[PDB]
Amino acid sequence: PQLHNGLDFSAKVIQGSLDSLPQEVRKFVEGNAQLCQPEYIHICDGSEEEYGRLLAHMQEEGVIRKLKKYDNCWLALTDPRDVARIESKTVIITQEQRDTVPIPKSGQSQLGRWMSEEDFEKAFNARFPGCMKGRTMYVIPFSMGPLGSPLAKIGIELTDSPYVVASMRIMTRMGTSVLEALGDGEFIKCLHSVGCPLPLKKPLVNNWACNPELTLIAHLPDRREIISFGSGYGGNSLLGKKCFALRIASRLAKEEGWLAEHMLILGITNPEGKKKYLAAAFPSACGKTNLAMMNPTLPGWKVECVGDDIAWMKFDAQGNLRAINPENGFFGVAPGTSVKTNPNAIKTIQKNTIFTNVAETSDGGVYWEGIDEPLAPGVTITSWKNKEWRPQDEEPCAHPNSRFCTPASQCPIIDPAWESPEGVPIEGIIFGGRRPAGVPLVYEALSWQHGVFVGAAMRSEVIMHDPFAMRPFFGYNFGKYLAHWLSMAHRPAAKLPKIFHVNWFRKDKNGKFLWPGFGENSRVLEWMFGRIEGEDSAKLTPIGYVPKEDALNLKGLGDVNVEELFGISKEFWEKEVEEIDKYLEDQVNADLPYEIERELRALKQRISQM
Ligand SMILES: Nc1nc2c(ncn2[C@@H]2O[C@H](COP(=O)(O)OP(=O)(O)OP(=O)(O)O)[C@@H](O)[C@H]2O)c(=O)[nH]1
Ligand SMILES: [Mn+2]
Ligand SMILES: [Mn+2]
Ligand SMILES: [Mn+2]
Ligand code: NA
């Protein structure tokens, strides 16, 4: 009801109907309409028409450019201040800090950033009131995972950014079908604003609305809310991407008995026609997308992609670890993507793809560092800063973490069960990062508990810790996350996947990679496949099982330096255990599970006996 006409926002709806919305959805939309004061409310239907028209509108406003070389491809160049995720401005709100991060023994937590309810409410009040003035508030009903999946979760994102709408259509299942399936069911409330109400208080840079000084990406797991202000970019704005997919979802996972992880999912088939699904957690810059879409060099082998970034996994009644890709597309790093490094991505991204912060060629194509493709004489390059650019300048033509946004259904090797509601059975979990020295190409954890330790001990690159590739993404206390992983071993009839650790990045004394990697990583996956089958192809070492002599198929690779590649040094590993000890003691402290501490003791002891 109302004594006037300030609460009913029906008159400002330009697509859809508030009356047709589920009650709790309407309250979410109208309540934030009252707060943010948008000019219009557009309830998205997810249709091709809505999509095409909105892209054309952004094009006319100069917000995006059409890439004329390709089929329905687009380019956005952002404000340089709004180029990536800002961890210092990414927070999780809970009653007690200990529930969000372990209280460190000595230093500051690097496992998350807590903000009190009190401090967030002040921050919220200083940002959102009237922030959508003069703008359309878009209502994005989206599913994270196949619509009918028991592993899927539903979100509603409100945004004043058409860039977010178009990108969410690609990255999630979006539209009217989602609302109809949701009904009076539960959903994650996602609120986003670029933080630039009209009239503009500050000058617009590169037609890219953002408020850097006030940027704040907040997560409120107990309220089932994500609230993001000031940034229009990637993980800060596409609230399904990391905020929902990893931070909120990992909390839900903890509560409900499942796992939300920074993992690719791939299906691998051998020459005997046997197929296994694998998951792998690597940090940013460590090649999940390359592995997920691998073109295998080994004859008779086939790799297929379920997902390249996020895995939602739950042990079923039969004890199989069932996994879905909750995403609907690939939000891949553009620089470094070539025919050599990722040929299947090259194929995917030439239609219906949105590019952000890459360079543009004179004939309307895309360009970036490591594209490994020469241009015809005459073809010139415009950089991501909208500047004339030559191949030999002291400046990259694309932003180091510039991205493409492409539909998953377009991947030539997309898995036939990539959107099967029941998910796919994971038989192996892979951990890894960038280690220039000391860490063998591949090793296998001795048990589930050792495997959890291996994930927890992950380091990459200055070499920094990134446990489970989840350091920027823990939705709650990492110690409790470790306990949650360990508890899976005590679950009824659980078939615990084999756990491996890989290192593509080991270098010799001259700084060149000892392993050719990319397509050649099918040789590593072959060994993993065999080990899952119970093949006697492993040699026991202090760090776990490694391939036997001659176990790894090296045919066609010439003379690979295996002794250096698989070399295990007592002195390196003595230092390794020490640094892992100090890290877990400080960062996890009182929340370090007994079994992780035990695995550290165990590894320390095995190394001492070298
Ligand atoms: N040497 C070597 N480098 C690799 C290999 N696979 C991937 N890379 C490198 O990894 C980088 C690309 O990986 P990213 O796309 O940033 O990794 P990602 O896990 O998909 O990152 P996010 O999308 O942010 O999650 C490039 O620099 C590649 O050269 C490999 O097998 N060997
Ligand atoms: Mn990726
Ligand atoms: Mn990622
Ligand atoms: Mn136990
Ligand atoms: Na722009």
- Looking at the fold, whether 508 and 591 belong to one and the same domain comes out as yes
Domain presence at residue 374: yes
The answer to whether 397 touches 383, Cβ cutoff 8 Å, is yes
- Name the helix (H) or strand (E) containing 558: none
Two tokens, residue 271: 């020459």
Domain that holds residue 252: 9-62+86-257
Contact 325, 307 (CB under 8 A): yes
Are residue 210 and residue 302 in the same domain, yes or no? no
Domain count, the chain: 3
Which residues in 199-232 are b (16+ Cβ under 10 Å) and which e?
eeeeeeebebbbbbebbbbbbbbeebbbbbbbbb
Structure tokens at 95: 């009653």
* Nearest CA owner, ligand 1 atom 4: 287
> Domain end: 385, 412, 439, which one?
412
Count other C-beta atoms under 10 Å from residue 421's C-beta: 15
Extract the annotated binding site for Mn(2+). Answer: 242, 262, 309
Q: Is 517 exposed, middle or buried (0-12, 13-18, 19+ CB in 10 A)?
A: middle
Q: 360 — phi, psi (to 5°)?
A: -115, 130
Domain-ending residue, one of 360, 385, 412:
412
Q: How far is CA 373 from CA 146, 327, 346, 370, in A?
A: 36, 30, 11, 8
Element housing 115 (H / E): strand 114-115
Instruction: Let me know whether 231 and 279 are in one domain.
Output: no
**Does 170 map to a domain?**
yes
Question: What is the C-alpha separation between 505 and 197, in angstroms, rounded?
Answer: 46
d(CA 503, CA 154): 36
Is there an atom of ligand 1 within 6 Å of 286 CB?
A: yes
* Closest residue CA from atom 7 of ligand 1: 287
- Ligand 1 pocket test, pick from 333, 337, 430, 513 with the greatest ligand atom count within 8 Å of Cβ, gives 333
Does residue 4 lie within any of the structural domains? no
Rounded to an integer, what distance in angstroms lies between the CA atom of residue 461 and that of residue 436?
A: 8
- How many angstroms does the Cα of residue 371 sit away from the middle of ligand 1? 13
Residues 595 and 450 in one domain: yes
CATH number for position 309: 3.90.228.20
Residues, beta carbon < 5 Å, ion ligand 3: 309
Task: Collect residues with CB below 5 Å from ion ligand 5.
Answer: 77, 206-208
Give yes or no for a contact between 413 and 303, defined as CB atoms under 8 angstroms apart: yes
Evaluate whether residue 432 is within a structural domain: yes
The residue from 373, 397, 412 where one domain ends is 412
Please report whether residue 2 resides in a domain: no
If residue 516 lies in a helix (H) or strand (E), which one and from where to where? none
Same-domain status, 394 and 360: yes
- Indicate if 333 and 251 belong to the same structural domain: no
- Domain check: are 48 and 172 in the same one? yes
Residue 1, domain member (yes or no): no
- 392 and 467 assigned to the same domain: no
Q: Pocket of ligand 1, candidates 291, 310, 341, 401: which has the most ligand atoms within 8 Å of its Cβ, to mutate?
A: 341
- Note if 286 is an active site residue: yes
Whether the CB of 407 sits within 6 Å of ligand 1: no
CB 197 within 8 A of CB 266: no
Which H or E run contains 235? Answer: helix 234-237
Q: Ramachandran region of residue 449, left (φ > 0), alpha (ψ -120 to 50) or beta?
A: alpha
Q: How many other C-beta atoms lie within 10 A of the C-beta of residue 190? A: 25
Residue 484 in contact with ligand 1 by CB distance below 6 A: no
- The CATH number for 351's domain is 2.170.8.10
The CATH code of the domain that includes 136 is: 3.40.449.10
Does residue 396 sit in the same domain as residue 456? no
Q: Which of 286, 358, 506, 514 to mutate to test the pocket of ligand 1 (most atoms within 8 A of CB)?
A: 286
Given CA atoms 135, 173, 469, 591 in this order, what sign does their dihedral have?
A: positive
Rounded to the nearest angstrom, the distance between the alpha carbon of 610 and the centre of ligand 5 is 58
Q: Note the resolution in Å, 1 decimal.
A: 1.9
Using what technique was this structure determined? Answer: X-ray
Q: Hunting for tokens 């589920």 — which residue is that?
A: 22
**Options 286, 305, 397, 411, the catalytic residue:** 286
Same domain, 448 and 323: yes
Residue 286: inside a domain: yes
- Name the packing angle between helices 478-487 and 448-456 (round to 10°): 160
Between the CA of 290 and the centroid of ligand 5 the distance, in Å, is 28
* DSSP code for 242: I
Asked if residues 590 and 109 have their Cβ atoms less than 8 Å apart, the reply is: no
Cα–ligand 4 centroid distance for 254 (angstroms): 17
> In angstroms, what is the span from residue 457 Cα to ligand 4's centroid?
18
Q: Is the CB of 471 under 6 A from ligand 1?
A: no
Please check whether residues 505 and 590 belong to one and the same domain: yes
Name, in order, each residue with C-beta under 8 angstroms of 18's C-beta and a sequence gap of 6 or more.
9, 10, 26, 29, 30, 41, 43
**505 and 600 both lie in a single domain:** yes
Phi, psi of 144 (to 5 degrees): -95, 95
Whether 190 is covered by a domain: the verdict is yes
User: Mapping DSSP to helix (H, G, I), strand (E, B) and coil, where does residue 173 land?
Assistant: strand
User: Please, which residues have CB within 8 angstroms of residue 533's CB and are 6 or more apart in sequence?
Assistant: 274
The protein residues having their C-beta less than 5 angstroms from ligand 2 (an ion) are: 288-289, 332
> How far apart are alpha carbons 193 and 196 in whole angstroms?
8
CA torsion 566-567-570-573 (nearest 10°) is -50
Nearest CA owner, ligand 1 atom 19: 288
